Design a protein around this ligand. Structure first.
Ligand SMILES: Cc1ncsc1CCOP(=O)(O)O
Ligand SMILES: C=C1C=NC(C)=NC1=N
Ligand SMILES: [Mg+2]
Length: 226
């Protein structure tokens, strides 16, 4: 994955969303970069650098951690997506940026990043359609299930929005997020999602590599079966 000179295709974007690992240093008790490396080795298809909050690294320390995580992704041949930080994404030549509703304006971000991958968090039909109109390459829908990893969370919606979006004929790449585990991932794909994203199921697993591998196998099976 080099410098993109064209918008990513729907097909490729959907493949990348399969097992979307998201992590910051405060999401694990182990060595951060090591966990990322293990998740990639196990089979994560996309990684999002999400380092924020009172327990996260800041300044130069955060930037250096970002560089190492990006290096790990490059070694695994997996794209590196930055959460919220547009400047960081541009400075590191990340493969993409993921933003939320409270964040900035998707239209503005799309203009600033050229043909880089753009993900937008959406919780309602209106937000999903607006994200598509603004030029997002994918939307993250959730919380699907209960989760404490992110406290300022919206109401749990199961796979309701995913189904609604598909029923309306919207084909934008979708990834589910929120309390997803190997045990409850299948229904997310069955509802019409193109993959699952998670933090704790992998970051806090006693065996992150095996957890990621189990996810990879499960998701592939269900994509073929739907
Ligand atoms: C970042 C985020 N956004 C909505 S729910 C959530 C947390 C995902 O963490 P976990 O996979 O551990 O529930
Ligand atoms: C809120 C989010 C929604 N979707 C994804 C993929 N990541 C997030 N951090
Ligand atoms: Mg955000």
């Amino acid at each position: 994955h080099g410098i993109r000179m064209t918008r990513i295709s729907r097909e490729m974007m959907k493949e990348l969303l399969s097992v979307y690992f998201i992590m910051g240093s405060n999401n694990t008790k182990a060595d951060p970069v090591t966990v990322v490396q293990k998740a990639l080795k196990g089979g994560a298809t996309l990684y999002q650098f999400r380092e924020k909050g009172g327990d996260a690294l800041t300044g130069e320390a955060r930037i250096k951690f970002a560089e190492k995580a990006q290096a790990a992704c490059r070694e695994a041949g997996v794209p590196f997506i930055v959460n919220d930080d547009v400047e960081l994404a541009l400075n590191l030549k990340a493969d993409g940026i993921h933003i939320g509703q409270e964040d900035a304006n998707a239209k503005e971000v799309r203009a600033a990043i050229g043909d880089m991958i753009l993900g937008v968090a959406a919780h309602t039909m209106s937000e999903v359609k607006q994200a598509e109109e603004d030029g997002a390459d994918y939307v993250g829908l959730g919380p699907i299930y209960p989760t404490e990893t992110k406290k300022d969370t919206r109401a749990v919606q199961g796979v309701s929005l995913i189904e609604a979006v598909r029923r309306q004929g919207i084909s934008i790449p979708i990834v589910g997020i929120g309390g997803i585990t190997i045990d409850n991932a299948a229904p997310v794909i069955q509802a019409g999602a193109d993959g699952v994203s998670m933090i704790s199921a992998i970051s806090q697993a006693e065996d992150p590599e095996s957890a990621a591998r189990k996810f990879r196998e499960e998701i592939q099976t269900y994509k073929t079966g739907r």
